[PDB]
Amino acid sequence: APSPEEKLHLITRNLQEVLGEEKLKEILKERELKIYWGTATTGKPHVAYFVPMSKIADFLKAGCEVTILFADLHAYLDNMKAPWELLELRVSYYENVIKAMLESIGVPLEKLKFIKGTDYQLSKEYTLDVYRLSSVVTQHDSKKAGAEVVKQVEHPLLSGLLYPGLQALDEEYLKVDAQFGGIDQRKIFTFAEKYLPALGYSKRVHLMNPMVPGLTGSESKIDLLDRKEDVKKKLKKAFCEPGNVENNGVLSFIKHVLFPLKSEFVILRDEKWGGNKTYTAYVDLEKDFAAEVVHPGDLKNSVEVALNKLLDPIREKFNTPALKKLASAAYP
Amino acid sequence: APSPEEKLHLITRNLQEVLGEEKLKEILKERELKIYWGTATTGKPHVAYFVPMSKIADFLKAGCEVTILFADLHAYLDNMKAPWELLELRVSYYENVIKAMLESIGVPLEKLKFIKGTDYQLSKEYTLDVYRLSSVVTQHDSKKAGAEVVKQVEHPLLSGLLYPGLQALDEEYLKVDAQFGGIDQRKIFTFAEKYLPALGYSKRVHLMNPMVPGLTGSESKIDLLDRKEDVKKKLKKAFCEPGNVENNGVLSFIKHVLFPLKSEFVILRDEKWGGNKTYTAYVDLEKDFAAEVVHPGDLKNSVEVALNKLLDPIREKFNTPALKKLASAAYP
Fold it and tell me: Which residue pairs form cystines in this protein (chains A, B)?
């Protein structure tokens, strides 16, 4: 063990949609799945970044080979004045924060690979394939395909129409069986399934997470390096309506990040209201929240303790001289 | 000699339009002009190809450094099934026919350079600049810019929007001061003058020939290798209306190809109608044609003799075993 059925469950739990189940099962009967996930390197990640990271951890725990693609070429093109280093210092900050996050979750990293787009997206073979793609991709499909995902400008750039085919070719050049992302990427993924065969390449399996509401919703966001006192204050302002299970950023963070750690979640609650309870199925926590026997305040306190456990080793790592230095440069 | 004024006259005679006269004169006060001209390598050239070749000959005679860019990458992308070799055999046919044409005109070739697009259009620096261009070129300007020139399809390809910026970057990567082409390329040329500075590169001088009506007008066309008997028959079917000087493919071929050889043209005419006459100014031939004292038949006979003089060494070169072989392969 784990068996092919167990691997399939770990790979696909919590996803909104799977494209390519037939090929996914054929691969898992024989060998480990190869998957990539792309990240931008521009913003400053906050605790929402744990939602894709929780699936990356699942893939690693299932035995998959996981490549994380850092989009540095794209980052430079959306801010060409944005000085050289600063872009690659931010790539380096993202690489170090992802490693720390996965170490905190607690998964084996031997099969995790980090690649930068510029490592190969300017190579002659890849560029020739981009030209081939431009000679079969209609201008329509590229906008259609990119109908969301591409930031929407008034005088839109050519760059926008190139994005979908570059993402498709990354599947082939990273030599993976599958790409993971969000359901908001669905039209990019179906574009890749249509047009890779035109170039003689295989369509890939596509794994799509839901768009998970933010924890604070339901700067102002909890940064991965925020200290305990600010985690505490920001979570106490989090929206969390009593009995609301359908649209609740606190429950969503438990479903997608905290419950999966050990397939359980501890609610901290005063003895007066029943004392602590350990849930072994998310649906059971949902039922009690909908019944209003788990109060929002207690839900938030329960998330605060578990989240601070996840953040503690990351904050400690980033307070060493070498990473404290990097964080300041990447984000003056 | 020749002086800067003489070079300017040879470079710009017969053009429809010059963009960049100020920079052109500044360069010719100091050094030789560097110019490129691009050619496709797909069709089978016919005698109309002498119209751009006559300007290439002028540039060489003026002392310019001339680069001819063979668009082989573009040729492959518009026919990817179109087998490898066959595309490059056609590049080789075009290289050999241009050399023979210029040798027949009689110009020095020391400063003529042949480059294939694939020699550099897949290089990392060039590709990065293509991505930079895509991040400043609006999708509008590229279609606007490409409003003619790009073959017009119903479900148009992305490839079409890339063409104008690739042509612009060729100016920089070929390290020229100027690009020559047809007036039908004007919107591509003004695109290059707008967007090269965005990348930190200089705008170029642009030299534009008119769109010259075909000789036969005014397969069915005279191929550069057609034998004398077929030249004769095809020219006798050429349209050439008596007294018509404004739209006359026979007069246009004389203006753009034959008169420039020695800045004269001999009309062959029977003694009954005045005998032969040597014109030293095209306007003088135009006046006599408009006066109907040069008959269409005599105009055509005069072109037949001069054209067969131009074609004779080309036909002889292409009848050697090595070039006869190449012609058949390039065009089964």
Answer: none
Instruction: Show binding-site residues of B for L-tyrosine.
Output: 36, 163, 167, 170, 185
Q: Do A142 and B158 lie within an 8 Å CB cutoff?
A: yes
Does A162 lie at the interface with B, CB-CB under 8 angstroms? yes
A32 CA: distance to closest CA in chain B (Å)? 34
Measured between beta carbons, the chain B residues lying within 8 angstroms of A127 are 122, 127
Q: What 8-state DSSP symbol labels residue A65?
A: E
In angstroms, this model's resolution equals 1.2
- A38 beta partners: A69
* Maximal CA-CA distance, chain B: 70
Handedness of CA A232, A238, A244, A249 (dihedral sign): negative
A217 three-state secondary structure? coil
Report the distance separating Cα B225 and Cα B237, nearest Å.
19
Q: Where in chain B is the domain with CATH 3.40.50.620?
A: 2-210
Q: For residue B160, how far is the Cα from the chain centroid?
A: 22
Residues of A in contact with B140 (CB under 8 A): 155
Q: Where does chain A hold its CATH 1.10.240.10 domain(s)?
A: 214-332
Q: Are A283 and A253 in contact (CB under 8 A)?
A: no
- Classify domain B2-210 at the CATH topology level: Rossmann fold (3.40.50)
Bridge-partner residues for B279, per DSSP? B265
Asked whether the beta carbons of B214 and B247 are under 8 A apart, the reply is no
CB-based burial label for A113 (10 Å; 0-12, 13-18, 19+): middle
